[PDB]
Ligand binder design. Structure first.
Ligand SMILES: [Mg+2]
Ligand SMILES: [Mg+2]
Lengths: 253, 253
């Protein structure tokens, strides 16, 4: 029979699904502010269709962000999400009021303690292996309170093909066993096995089913690696020009 | 500025996206009737998630079916669509009250007159070429009012790989120039160039923009060939276990 709410539960990626930076839009086109930079100034935008879409979705369903952003960067997202969030590539769950989920934090600490020294070492080596190769990079360890989660690397060349080079080398040098990778645009991330959007979405659904039983689940994402959590949904969706959609277009023809 | 409605326009495939036959569901599982056969008895069903999903979508957005079903077969779909429909693989547009769109019918007649004899000939040959390789098939020409639209072929072996064989031969014998194909499950269709869900959806959007300007457009489909019309949308979506989703899963790994 029916229990709890029967409205859809919608897991949404953030960057390049709901909004994007100025450099990824055509100059001069209408837009509204979706994110702020660390200096408090706008740095991510929605075009009019994007704003209409997320407003409709927020009003029509229970919308849960599923994002690589850490808690601080998620707090600079200026959208009125009301149901909590999954942050830091699945390393963090936030309650609706923004407080940290202590249970998941405990489970994550368990999965990631074997990695706590390797992650700073791997970021150091990558940034050095990058200068060695000759690129002007940057990178850091994403961490949430002491617990270190994953490694991210970006380039300042305006050439995202730089990151594919490095990824090819670190793979050869075998610095990535027991881990998985995310590469989209100017972002290359190295993630421990037990850190994934999929695992957090899996847990979110387990908790939801105790309250609301089986209700429609929809997943929205733009990256190929978003297919991990999207495959847990009844239906999944992608923007027409996303990394994922472009890959699908090449597969059919 | 704003004009008309700003609710999403959602183009939805029907068979295997919103519902399916009994043979495609697990025996005994809960279900509700979505379609009737020609004898008036139920023959397509929604599981509880599917029913919750389409009810939500119909209440939340302007939903337009985009279907291979001809007008008679669409009339056996027992869902309360209120905005009209695209039928017969894009060959037919219906107004909200179910009456035929005369303009599109005129444009289709124009595109398909060079095919009016070839389609019965191609169906005849395919059904004969099928008995020769010895499969027990069946097929016919889909037509609405005299104007012939496309050729469909099915098999009674319970072996959908039979149709891939025939398709390989008719392609070799070159009976399909100037045409395109749809193959999913126990269905193989040969379509003239100017007959496509994409063309009708393209026209539907052109008309909508004169009334409602630019509003979010979402496309839902399960077949690889549904990517034609889905690529005209701002976002597209698919059931997690569709032909399309299965192809995407093989492309990534
Ligand atoms: Mg993203
Ligand atoms: Mg279908």
């Amino acid at each position: 029979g029916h229990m709890g709410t029967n409205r859809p539960l919608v897991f949404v990626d953030l960057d390049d699904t709901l909004f994007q930076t100025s450099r990824k839009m055509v100059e001069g086109t209408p837009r509204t502010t979706a994110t702020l930079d660390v200096h408090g100034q706008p740095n991510g935008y929605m075009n009019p269709i994007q704003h209409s879409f997320i407003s409709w979705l927020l009003a029509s369903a229970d919308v849960v962000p599923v994002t690589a952003r850490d808690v601080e960067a998620y707090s600079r997202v200026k959208l009125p999400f009301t149901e909590g969030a999954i942050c830091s590539h699945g390393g963090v769950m936030l309650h609706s009021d923004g407080s940290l989920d202590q249970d998941w934090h405990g489970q994550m600490a368990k999965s990631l303690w074997a990695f706590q020294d390797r992650l700073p070492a791997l970021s150091e080596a990558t940034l050095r292996i990058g200068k060695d190769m000759g690129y002007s990079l940057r990178g850091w360890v994403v961490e949430e309170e002491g617990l270190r989660h994953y490694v991210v690397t970006k380039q300042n060349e305006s050439d995202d093909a730089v990151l594919s080079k490095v990824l090819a080398e670190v793979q050869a040098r075998g610095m990535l066993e027991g881990m998985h990778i995310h590469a989209n645009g100017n972002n290359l991330a190295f993630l421990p096995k037990g850190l994934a959007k999929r695992l957090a979405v899996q847990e979110w659904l387990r908790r939801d089913a105790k309250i609301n039983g089986d209700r429609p689940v929809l997943g929205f994402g733009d990256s190929i690696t978003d297919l991990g959590f999207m495959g847990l949904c009844h239906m999944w969706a992608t923007p027409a020009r996303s990394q994922l959609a472009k890959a699908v277009e090449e597969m059919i023809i």
